[PDB]
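User: structure tokens for Family 11 Xylanase, please.
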Amino acid sequence: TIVTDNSTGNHDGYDYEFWKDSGGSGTMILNSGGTFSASWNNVNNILFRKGKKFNETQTHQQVGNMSINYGANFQPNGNAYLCVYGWTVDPLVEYYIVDSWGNWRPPGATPKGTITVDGGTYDIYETLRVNQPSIKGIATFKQYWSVRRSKRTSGTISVSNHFRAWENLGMNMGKMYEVALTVEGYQSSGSANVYSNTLRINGNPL
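Assistant: Done. Predicted tokens:
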């Protein structure tokens, strides 16, 4: 069913979220299980995601091994990411595992290292966000990034492998708040059809 405004629910067992600030328009259509499609037009910032929200009490190791099998028809006109996305609390952390992008490879900082995983190479990045909107109000928090060296819009993302690698370069993780397959748009238009999206925990689908 159709979402065109900030809305936070559950659909076919996947937690979904549509979030946009002021200006432009967006349409998220909710489909089977993890799938969805998105259209956005002249937005500042928009996020469409479908994944799992957590109760905020366990670390990633406790939650188990996570892996995402997805496929997407990704068509950005401008700045947009296709990625696994989410947060930890304590420390507050916003994180991105980016598999494809529009005209600009994020996040424009200095790579701290690389992980090679799922058939490709990812540069790793840490950035700082100072008094910014967050899930826990206006806060100061870090962003962790793994950004693929070349664009890909289907395959497996071994989410936990990334986390291990982040902790290994001393980028510590808090307690799981969310992991989700995300389309994010910045000052762009475009559309994305996420025809496939299965989150597995310990080999266990959703």
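User: Anything notable?

Assistant: The two ends are 19 Å apart (CA to CA).
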